[PDB]
Amino acid sequence: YQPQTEAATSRFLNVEEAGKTLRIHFNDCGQGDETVVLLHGSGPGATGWANFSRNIDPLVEAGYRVILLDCPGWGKSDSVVNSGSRSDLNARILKSVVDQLDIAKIHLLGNSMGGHSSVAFTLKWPERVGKLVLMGGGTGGMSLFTPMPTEGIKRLNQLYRQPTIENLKLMMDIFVFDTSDLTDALFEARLNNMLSRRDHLENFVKSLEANPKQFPDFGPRLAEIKAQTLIVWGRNDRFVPMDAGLRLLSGIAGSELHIFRDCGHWAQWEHADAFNQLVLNFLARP
């Protein structure tokens, strides 16, 4: 097995959204019968590839087709200004990409914003989803115990307005439990993605100005989900409180929640092996 590469799996497709046509980027990996979509977080400089670099190969080696969608406003995809539901917007784009590639069912691994988007997608088109895996996100709403805006979201919002190296370091320093895990390659890739697309950073800020609540609260509709769901969270997540994971657990019947204590807001990376093993086990369930 030869590890996958970004350039080799890179692809584009057009999607119709609100009367306008936008070019959307995504990485297509492997060819398996079952497909697994990975939706990135909302950090500045984030892309499907950089977010899931440590989880792509275990999925392909296992025989899954892996697609990492870069939501508009991030990566090589066109930028956009969202004044409505960010969650539903991305879900719409994924829907188009999925229909065009003629893919019937998909498993979802949503990270942070990706989690909200996966729940939105599953809520809208349940018949098009197999299993759902949520990490650090999934539903909008208030935390019962942690102050908001959270310590992390403040640094993320600040970085977006002032895309400096210092703010990138300020944000990432509390993004993961053990910063010794952050690599220079990782850091440099984000920074490069940040500075290479200032149109994204500017539109993200504008989206917040146009609509402060980018993510709907799907709480009351969680009873609708029939997909076998697995929720993953870090106990020390400083961006999205852990009790959000508890809410998702209480709302989705038959779900399970796995919490890593020594972990921040990026479990798929901080505890990659434990994570990839949980996911593969989960995805293999009947």
Q: Which positions are annotated as active-site residues?
A: 265
Nearer to a copy of itself, 104 or 253 (CB): 253
43 binds, among Cl ion, a copy of itself, none (CB under 5 to 8 A by kind): Cl ion
Measured between alpha carbons, how far apart are the two ends of the chain, in Å?
Answer: 26
Nearer to a copy of itself, 20 or 285 (CB): 285
Helix (H, G, I), strand (E, B) or coil at 38: strand
The residue with tokens 């993320």 is 156
142 binds, among a copy of itself, Cl ion, none (CB under 5 to 8 A by kind): none
255 binds, among a copy of itself, Cl ion, none (CB under 5 to 8 A by kind): a copy of itself
Nearer to Cl ion, 50 or 231 (CB): 50
User: How many CA atoms lie within 13 Å of 116's alpha carbon, on the beta-carbon side?
Assistant: 23
The residue with tokens 């065009």 is 100
Helix (H, G, I), strand (E, B) or coil at 9: helix
Name 212's Cβ contacts closer than 8 Å, sequence gap at least 6: none
41 binds, among Cl ion, a copy of itself, none (CB under 5 to 8 A by kind): Cl ion
Least distance in angstroms from the C-beta of 43 to Cl ion: 3
CA 90 to chain centre: 10
DSSP letter, residue 60: H
Nearer to a copy of itself, 174 or 242 (CB): 242
The Cα 132–Cα 106 span in angstroms is 9
Least distance in angstroms from the C-beta of 133 to a copy of itself: 14
Least distance in angstroms from the C-beta of 46 to Cl ion: 4
The Cα 90–Cα 88 span in angstroms is 6
Binding track, positions 216-255, relative to a copy of itself; x by CB under 8 A = -------------------x-------------xx-xxxx
Binding track, positions 253-272, relative to a copy of itself; x by CB under 8 A = xxxxxxxxxx----------
The Cα 142–Cα 147 span in angstroms is 9
φ, ψ at 227 (rounded to 5°): -75, 140
The Cα 153–Cα 215 span in angstroms is 14
Residue 68, Cβ neighbours under 10 Å: how many?
30
Residue in 24, 36, 46, 252 binding Cl ion, rule: CB under 5 A: 46
Identity of residue 265: H
Least distance in angstroms from the C-beta of 254 to a copy of itself: 5
Least distance in angstroms from the C-beta of 54 to a copy of itself: 17
Nearer to Cl ion, 41 or 152 (CB): 41
Q: Which parts of this chain interact with Cl ion (CB under 5 A)?
A: 41, 43, 46
Site residues, a copy of itself (CB under 8 A): 235, 249-250, 252-262, 274, 277, 281
